[PDB]
Amino acid sequence: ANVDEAILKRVKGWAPYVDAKLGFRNHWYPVMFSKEINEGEPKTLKLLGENLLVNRIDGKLYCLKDRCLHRGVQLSVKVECKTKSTITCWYHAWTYRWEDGVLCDILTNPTSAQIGRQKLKTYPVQEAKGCVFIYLGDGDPPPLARDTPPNFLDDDMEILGKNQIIKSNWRLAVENGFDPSHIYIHKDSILVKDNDLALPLGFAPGGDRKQQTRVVDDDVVGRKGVYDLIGEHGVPVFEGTIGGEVVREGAYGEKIVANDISIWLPGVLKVNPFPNPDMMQFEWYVPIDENTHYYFQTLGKPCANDEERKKYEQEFESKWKPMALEGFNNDDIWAREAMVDFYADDKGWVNEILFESDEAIVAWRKLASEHNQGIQTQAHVSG
Amino acid sequence: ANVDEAILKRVKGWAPYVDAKLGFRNHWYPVMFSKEINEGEPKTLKLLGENLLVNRIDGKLYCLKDRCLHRGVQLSVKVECKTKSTITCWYHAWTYRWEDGVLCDILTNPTSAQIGRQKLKTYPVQEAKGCVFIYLGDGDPPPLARDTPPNFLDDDMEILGKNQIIKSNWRLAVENGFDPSHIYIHKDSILVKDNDLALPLGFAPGGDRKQQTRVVDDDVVGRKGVYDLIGEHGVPVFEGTIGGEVVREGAYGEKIVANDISIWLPGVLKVNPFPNPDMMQFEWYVPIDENTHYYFQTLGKPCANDEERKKYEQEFESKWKPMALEGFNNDDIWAREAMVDFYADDKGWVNEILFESDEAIVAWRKLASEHNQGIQTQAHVSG
Amino acid sequence: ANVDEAILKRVKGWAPYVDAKLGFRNHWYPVMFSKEINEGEPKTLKLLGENLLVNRIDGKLYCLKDRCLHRGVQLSVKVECKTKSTITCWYHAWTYRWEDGVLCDILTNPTSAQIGRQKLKTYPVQEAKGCVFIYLGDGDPPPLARDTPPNFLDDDMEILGKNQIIKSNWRLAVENGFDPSHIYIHKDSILVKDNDLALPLGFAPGGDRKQQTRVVDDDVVGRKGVYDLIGEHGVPVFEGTIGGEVVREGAYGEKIVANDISIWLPGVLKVNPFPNPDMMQFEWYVPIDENTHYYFQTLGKPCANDEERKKYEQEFESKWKPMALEGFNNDDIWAREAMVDFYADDKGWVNEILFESDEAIVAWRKLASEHNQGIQTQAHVSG
Numbered sequence A, B, C: 001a002n003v004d005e006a007i008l009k010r011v012k013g014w015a016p017y018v019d020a021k022l023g024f025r026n027h028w029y030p031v032m033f034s035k036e037i038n039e040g041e042p043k044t045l046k047l048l049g050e051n052l053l054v055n056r057i058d059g060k061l062y063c064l065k066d067r068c069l070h071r072g073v074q075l076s077v078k079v080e081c082k083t084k085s086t087i088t089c090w091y092h093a094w095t096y097r098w099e100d101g102v103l104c105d106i107l108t109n110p111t112s113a114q115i116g117r118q119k120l121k122t123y124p125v126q127e128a129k130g131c132v133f134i135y136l137g138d139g140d141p142p143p144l145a146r147d148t149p150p151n152f153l154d155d156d157m158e159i160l161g162k163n164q165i166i167k168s169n170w171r172l173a174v175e176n177g178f179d180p181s182h183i184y185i186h187k188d189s190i191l192v193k194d195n196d197l198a199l200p201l202g203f204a205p206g207g208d209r210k211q212q213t214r215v216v217d218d219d220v221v222g223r224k225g226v227y228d229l230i231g232e233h234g235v236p237v238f239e240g241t242i243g244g245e246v247v248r249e250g251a252y253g254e255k256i257v258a259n260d261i262s263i264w265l266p267g268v269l270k271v272n273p274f275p276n277p278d279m280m281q282f283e284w285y286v287p288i289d290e291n292t293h294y295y296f297q298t299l300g301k302p303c304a305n306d307e308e309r310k311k312y313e314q315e316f317e318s319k320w321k322p323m324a325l326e327g328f329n330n331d332d333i334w335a336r337e338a339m340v341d342f343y344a345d346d347k348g349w350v351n352e353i354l355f356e357s358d359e360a361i362v363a364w365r366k367l368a369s370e371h372n373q374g375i376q377t378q379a380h381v382s383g
């Protein structure tokens, strides 16, 4: 539906992933932090290509599509919230209920036969760990835990993070994240120097294809994921050679990080431990449109009480955010960007030449192709 | 000719209107004010997608296509008017007469077989009421009166105005203007409060469908238009309600305006009286290209003589222009622009959900569809 | 392929020229000066739509395609030359030899089965007269002399120049440079006044529509060009008339220049003498992409020794560069740009109306259609 048929035909093993340029419908996605949306101060955003309005009413979050049923304007051009439970289009005053999207009045014509017979699309929203998730799908949603990685929701896990808009397709972000050889780009990171990380240049793989990863398509709550096992079973490269001469070495630090690396639908990576042996990183690459994503980064640490939490917050602002979320992951941002040209006409999916460590990426494309809950298309966007 | 055939088959009530992205060929259009073009100072503009040159020679206006027949450059890049009656292309000196577009000379080759055998396209041009109108069409033009609203050309009507370029398709602008319910957006206007206008929020429509409008396809000079009669049979709504609670109002005003409202081919709105009970407003939404229009605003006041026009003038400059043309209509500008995205891909014409006050708009779309003098296409722009 | 068949069928005699929007493959093109490319300091450029990396290694120049075989990134986003004879991709460290493009190592996986089984595209590169030429084609190159105008390579000919990126398609630049009547645009040039050039407004042909050009098919080096003879055989126009009245005069002058004017594949103009009797101008219009070219300008002067070269360089910097290359050719820059719109949708190639002096341009279009060594396409830009 999104990609030229010629191209889709020529990718067989994961064609629906190739098609999912706008992301996967019927999943939850984080879009902002809870502290970024205040009582009665609606925020606008784009997700899976659809513009959305999110408001907080009596502490609770609601989501309406930011497109009036009448002439298709964004309501957010001029927000008119005249009662606590409704929003009034600025143009001809069609008035919708935030709770169910029902067109419940029209100030310019109280007699209209439309009133009570139309419904603006709404989306479920839920807050968890200080993060706003929108279920960008139809019908009653599954629990949040299905579309989060293991441990993200643990009672004791304190989540902090950072969000920004990145100009690449979401899949280029996912694949960069889950790619075992990409760690080559991080070899000069200030995190690696200053936090004394052990970091190989990459890994020589051992065993055949199926041993490189482990698919998790079971799971209690229905999570679908892939664990990368390359560097559990492979030989780390610490001395990179060209024609037999050592030209570059890996980082010989003392802290062991990234023992477990996994990727989960709808597109969230878990790195454990990281950036320190006590923490986890959970980052989402959230489809905004064809060319754009939210890079929704979080760092988790278990905390039993409240002064732990206060200690963690101060470590986050002074150390983990600048050193790791920026100083390590910035190189990820421009690596994603650098893949844009080759994949932008959709021909990179056919012309790429993969090698052995891309086994993890192929597993991901397969898992996503068969376990996503729907392919967002242009018909979902303009409909 | 301009829109996907699948879309045209779904808007059968008014398909040629939806097709008319560039506007309607074979009508007169105002493009500037007479006083903005001085003797021997050609001006450049784009109309219906076509770049044009207008010049004032011995006080008479002339219009040539601003595209040399030879290599297709705009002559306006470097104007060379070497005699009063001619223009010489800056590139190889092909020289045209303003009066008939004939290639009368070539300075670079005075023996060319082309000389006297080629003709650059010219368009009729006429000045009335201090406005420059160009007949963007072929053959013998009609009287200007066919393509202007009633009273505009009355002998004592003094016209004053303002022109600017707005980034929406001309149809967005026409429909916004003729929309009986859009006046919602004007509820906080400075004009409404400072000139004691009795402006409702909308109208509960009364009587039957056929009574909401009155098509004029029966004017003796050949005018084609639609009167909006929603305020004749309908009830004005001055109190805005949601759930039976008053949330908004029309407030304090004694002056009745805009009881006479009509839209006329090729796309000009008449509102009478407005902005005061002794004036009327005529405004055009002139297609520049697919994405742009001139918003050619005029105010008409009947004036007996030279002194009465001077008093109209002072008052236009100090009160009516800042308060009404700018103050009141600025909201119209941002409303048009807010419909751009919905209609950009031609999908809005199928996906809109109209209500009762949009009878006026539908009547216009049918009128435009039936009585236009041709659809401008890209083949007219290029060839 | 690059152009619609409904246009190509309408330009019989020169359709391969109209199709060659990206230029002609399998020719040498100049892209920069020798001094701009130093030992061990790779430079990036785009040629025939392809991103290329050039490097200097032990004085010798090499050219690799700037696109990794793995995931299609430009290597030049972060250049990593880890040994003299190789470049290592910054992403997963696939490592290529400059000399043959072979994938000789991967730092991230020294056991990959890709090593020694993939080859990145290379192109021959050669330096002549201080200018770097890349053979943008396949297989073994021809001699450089085939794709350079007569006398550019003469032993005594000292070459100085200037290069810049211009936003027009390359063909518009070529046609402007070889166009006999375009000299009309140069009529007010300071060069013309200050160096007392004889410069007519144009030339009325001397007789038949078949003695205006001389096609050079022969030439033992294999060069393919057209000489413009109108200047030698026509009647110069020094008094331009409209309605029989003189409106403009040409520039009288002592110095006769541009006796010998020729255009050569792949798109290089030779003007002799110019801008003074003992000098020549050779300029290339080198396709970068569909909308852009390098304007690669050179002036040749025979210099017997170092004192003559030194004298020439001072005169170049103080006068010829500012007065001729900048002052005089600046009007050719905007003349090219002014043709963009008409030819942008490919319709100008059908809608243009040619006159007698365009016989030169037509002879060039047919020559180029005949003797080009292949049309560059998007598929070559990809694969």
Ligand code: FES
Binding pocket: A068, A069, A070, A071, A072, A073, A089, A090, A091, A092, A093, A094
């Ligand atoms: S566009 Fe929202 S009420 Fe008309």
Ligand code: FES
Binding pocket: B068, B069, B070, B071, B072, B073, B089, B090, B091, B092, B093, B094
């Ligand atoms: S383009 Fe106008 S005379 Fe050649």
Ligand code: FES
Binding pocket: C068, C069, C070, C071, C072, C073, C089, C090, C091, C092, C093, C094
């Ligand atoms: S993209 Fe160059 S090595 Fe992976």
Ligand SMILES: [Fe+2]
Binding pocket: A176, A177, A182, A183, A186, A329, A332
């Ligand atoms: Fe990374």
Ligand SMILES: [Fe+2]
Binding pocket: B176, B177, B182, B183, B186, B329, B332
């Ligand atoms: Fe309005």
Ligand SMILES: [Mg+2]
Binding pocket: A098, A099, A100, A101, A122, A123
């Ligand atoms: Mg709800």
Ligand SMILES: [Mg+2]
Binding pocket: B098, B099, B100, B101, B122
């Ligand atoms: Mg005329």
Ligand SMILES: [Mg+2]
Binding pocket: C192, C193, C196, C197, C198, C251, C252, C253, C254
């Ligand atoms: Mg002179």
